[PDB]
Design a protein around this ligand. Structure first.
Ligand SMILES: [Zn+2]
Lengths: 119, 52, 275, 246, 283, 203, 72
């Protein structure tokens, strides 16, 4: 949290951790995304997954994304077929294109995007 | 030339003798014989590859 | 090779302290200055310069002049160049400088009480009688000799507050100039150029308006009115590496300086006196 | 070999003779020299690492050389190494005078085998050519951190005489990387020295045959300058004679 | 770069505060004299040289025991004939400005003193004057910030532990004249409280107690107090009468024939004052 | 010993040239001055002062010297003559001094074999050990550069003296053939060119 | 090693004894001498465990304590 505040230029004595975290509640629901700060805090506690929703909400925001309420954190494995792009040929093609276009030689990594219950 | 420096300049030598001592300690258990062998053979094999 | 580098006659009487004295060579120049360029810059924010007057064939009148080292934002103490005896102790952070330098300043301003206080304090140094008193004697004698040399009363018609149009009345800058020590007065004469120079009923104007100000606080790099004049100024690193190898360049540059221009110099029937 | 001493009193003829085998002192001397040379080389390597740190580049060395985009850091590292070697030969020199150009080749048809770092003037100033792919390949080749390298009598004597003692990212692998880079830049520096002090034709001849290095350098190096890093050991190609016959 | 990302390294650290003294005039090079003792990780946060120079005090060890515990202790360098202000071994916050000649010493040391003694007004005055003095921005500002940061780091290391010791139950110390039937002792504890946390730590490290009760055993190192504390601070004065003779044999024939190799009692005057209590060893 | 005294005299002459340089009071070393083409006035002043110094040495009894001279710093190859970086032409009564700044810069920039060569010297390890038990500067490279420039201007000044004493015709003929001053000293003694010899052999 | 004073006194007394023997008629002897017990190899000379240098008027006596210990 201190590193995040310093990066944002927030004086530590000025900002309290609770308020710092609450800052992203404006993002939680409207963008239907879990703030990275909350994700990292949950990971720290785990070393010592996330899920939430709103009143009357039909779906739950989770670290994995959108999930139907009361459903498991992951949809059935065969829900989506990624073979079209989730394949070595496509991955290598995209990575090589990126390397060429950016004139790079290292530090480049492309990953197929998987999808939970919803796209 | 992709890039260049101007004339003169100055080699940026380190100054922290304590830092130098720490590095020396960190490298003491490394056998110079093994490091030399590895480096020489690395260069030799890369040259071999280039030639071939 | 007489070293007139006042403020280089400073000896770190403290054993643990070593005084580099890294000051300008020109002290060995038998000029009207009694303080060479680096001391001048450090302790008065002035840079030595020369202003030629007649330079045609062999008439080479080259009046000396120093330059402001004060920007257009400094004010009050920050802007005062040569403080008066009433405020020099405040303008200068005497406590932040070596006691020998403090003694030099006190002698220059005739602060004999401060001189006595400093020597009394030095009385209680560990090697006081051994070498502290010797250092005191050396520094004091050198400073006193310089001051006597500067003072003309020892063994001409330059007026500094007489230029100021729009002033209510009074002048008195010349009054304070008189109140100054011989060394300070000679420094002012040497560094400040009268805006006007009259020779045997022949007036030359060098500026359309004086640049310096003199008042009770002392000499100030202020303007007679309006805002202040604009006065701007290896360890190989990663950033020091330059990228690939690859607008009035053809014209000379007028200095963005603020030379000390203030006063009127009157010269009697004497001709182009070049001795 | 051996020596002997005789003690005798002036007034008496009863003399006591003792014999000494110099092998012990030979072992002492050899151990002392080996330790001294090891210390010197490790000091130089640590100094090199420290100055590179002083440049304060975030990434490690291999990552730097892999990042083709950031030619700035590659040039900085190469020049710093070259200047360090130059000073190691001329300790009184802390700069390189004439400005230096740098280019980073990217293809085999642009690289020259056996000289990853080379020099050529544009008729006004010297340009250093760098084979970044080759540098990356060398520093990426897997290193052996396990096997040891090597008169059995003195070997045993040293074994029984000498003793042994049982927060930096550096492992022996990174130390090896730094040493390899230093040696490569040293080779390039020798080429450049021959160039500067004997003309471009001599430089080309040296490139063709390094043997000229012998005279062109030993005239000044062995006398006034710290010995070459490689001087620490005698190197040889396994099965050199049969390979030559091949 | 070589080192792991961040990864705070571990090395020795000079501990005496005065080691940070440097000439604000970058054009004037200065080296402060530091005794090598400064590099010992001990309770002392002042080196022997600075201690003797500024406080007239010399470090010393007092063996204590089966297991020989070594208790830190300082000793007088004050001569017998010194009087008045000379007797102030450690000036109080109300007198240090006078006892220490701020004018005669460097601005950095004056700041160090105004930090040790909790003089925020003086610290601010010095900071502002340096802001408006010399090429502050170029390097003088960074030098001043470095010195201030070092001093503040030392003080932040000391003060929390000092406060915990103050409120501590197991370890108790009382800097006064154990001879309650005396007038030169006074509210020594109150004066010690008035002192700063770091100054309190220094006093603890320097002045040994006249008595020491460990659990149930009490050891009486003295039948008298060798120093006192008043409003002026730590005073090298005898609470009951004539000053103790302090030969100062160093630093600032038949007799020997008989007195060949022969045990000799030192003439030093260690600091013994007050009562100390402890539970268990805590060592 | 004696030869050491003559060495001391030669080094004193170099030191006098150093005093002349300090009198000129150049911020930069002559190498940088010559490298900087814009410093045309500095280059001309350096050359003129060196020539006057050499004139005073060659004619100790004569302190006079041409107090004004036309100067031209040349840069192009076609504006220079191999073996004569400095030239003294006349533009119909006007005395022009041409300077080959690129050649000067090249000579100065050449690496010198200071360390490379080993030469005999006062070397007594006993004295060194005894000393050990009893216990603004100029480098060798800078001194070499400075000597090179002084000798270059000495050659130029000799050609100039031929020009003035004999005429432009003989000056050109001297440029063609330098045999006139194989004898040299025959005044000249104060010229370093008369102190040593240099030769070239087929090989 | 901590017995630096003892080592220096031993050396000085031995030197005075040898001086008295070598000059029986002379009882005088330098009554003060600077002493330095050396330990590092670079601070010693083979074949001369004891040395007498001068630090510009100051007479220094260097001692090779490790060599003395080895011989003994
Ligand atoms: Zn210290």
């Amino acid at each position: 949290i201190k590193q995040a505040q310093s990066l944002l230029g927030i004086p530590d004595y000025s900002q309290t951790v609770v308020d710092f975290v609450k800052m992203f509640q404006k993002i939680i629901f409207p963008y239907q995304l879990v703030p990275n700060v909350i994700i990292k805090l949950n990971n720290f506690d785990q070393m010592v997954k996330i899920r939430l929703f709103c009143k009357n909400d039909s779906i739950a925001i989770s670290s994995s994304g959108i999930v139907p309420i009361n459903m498991p954190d992951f949809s059935p494995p065969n829900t989506f077929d990624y073979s079209d792009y989730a394949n070595r040929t496509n991955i290598n093609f995209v990575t090589q294109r990126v390397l060429t276009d950016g004139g790079f030689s290292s530090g480049i990594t492309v990953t197929p995007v998987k999808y939970n219950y919803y796209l | 030339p992709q890039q260049y420096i101007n004339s003169g300049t100055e080699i940026p030598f380190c100054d922290d003798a304590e830092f130098l001592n720490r590095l020396l300690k960190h490298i003491d258990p490394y056998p110079l014989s093994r490091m030399y062998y590895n480096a020489a053979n690395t260069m030799f094999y890369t040259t071999m590859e280039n030639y071939a | 090779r007489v070293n007139r580098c006042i403020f280089a006659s400073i000896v770190s009487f403290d054993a643990c302290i070593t005084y580099k004295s890294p000051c300008s060579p020109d002290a060995y120049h038998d000029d009207g200055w009694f303080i060479c360029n680096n001391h001048l810059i450090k302790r008065f924010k002035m840079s030595k310069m020369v202003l030629p007057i007649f330079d045609e064939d062999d008439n080479q009148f080259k009046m000396t002049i120093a330059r402001h080292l004060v920007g257009n934002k400094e004010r009050g103490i920050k802007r005062i160049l040569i403080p008066s005896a009433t405020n020099y102790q405040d303008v200068f952070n005497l406590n932040s400088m070596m006691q020998a330098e403090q003694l030099i300043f006190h002698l220059i301003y005739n602060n004999e009480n401060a001189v006595n206080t400093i020597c009394d304090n030095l009385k209680y140094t560990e090697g006081f009688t051994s070498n502290t008193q010797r250092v005191i004697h050396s520094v004091y004698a050198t400073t006193k000799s310089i001051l006597d040399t500067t003072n003309p009363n020892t063994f001409e018609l330059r007026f500094f507050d007489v230029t100021n149009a729009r002033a209510l009345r009074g002048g008195a800058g010349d009054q304070l100039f008189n109140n100054y020590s011989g060394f300070l007065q000679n420094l002012i004469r040497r560094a400040v150029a009268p805006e006007y120079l009259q020779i045997d009923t022949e007036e030359l104007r060098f500026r359309n308006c004086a640049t310096c100000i003199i008042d009770e606080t002392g000499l100030v790099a202020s303007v007679p009115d309006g805002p202040e004049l604009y006065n701007p100024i290896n360890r190989l690193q990663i950033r020091n590496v330059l990228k690939f190898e690859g607008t009035l360049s053809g014209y000379e540059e007028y200095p963005t300086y603020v030379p000390l221009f203030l006063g009127y110099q009157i010269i009697n029937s004497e001709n182009n006196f070049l001795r | 070999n051996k020596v002997r001493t005789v003690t005798e009193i002036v007034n008496s003829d009863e003399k006591i003779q003792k014999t000494y085998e110099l092998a012990e002192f030979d072992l002492k001397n050899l151990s002392s020299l080996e330790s001294y040379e090891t210390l010197k080389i490790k000091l130089a390597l640590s100094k090199y690492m420290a100055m590179l740190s002083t440049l304060e580049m975030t990434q490690p060395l291999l990552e730097i050389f892999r990042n083709k985009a950031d030619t700035r850091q590659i040039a900085a590292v190469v020049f710093s190494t070259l200047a360090f070697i130059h000073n190691r030969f001329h300790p009184l020199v802390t700069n390189f005078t004439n400005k230096m150009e740098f280019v980073v080749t990217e293809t085999n048809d642009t690289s020259i085998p056996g000289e990853p770092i080379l020099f050529t003037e544009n008729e006004g100033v010297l340009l250093c050519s760098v084979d970044r792919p080759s540098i990356v390949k060398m520093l990426s080749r897997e290193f052996d951190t396990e096997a040891l390298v090597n008169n059995c009598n003195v070997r045993i004597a040293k074994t029984f005489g000498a003793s042994k003692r049982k927060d930096f990212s550096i492992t022996e692998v990174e130390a090896t990387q730094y040493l390899t880079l230093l040696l490569t830049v040293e080779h390039a520096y020798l080429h450049y020295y021959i160039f500067k002090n004997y003309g471009v034709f001599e430089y080309c001849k040296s490139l063709t045959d390094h043997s000229l290095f012998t005279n062109k350098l030993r005239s000044t190096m062995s006398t006034k300058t710290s010995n070459l890093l490689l001087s620490k050991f005698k190197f040889t190609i396994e099965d050199f004679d049969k390979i030559n016959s091949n």
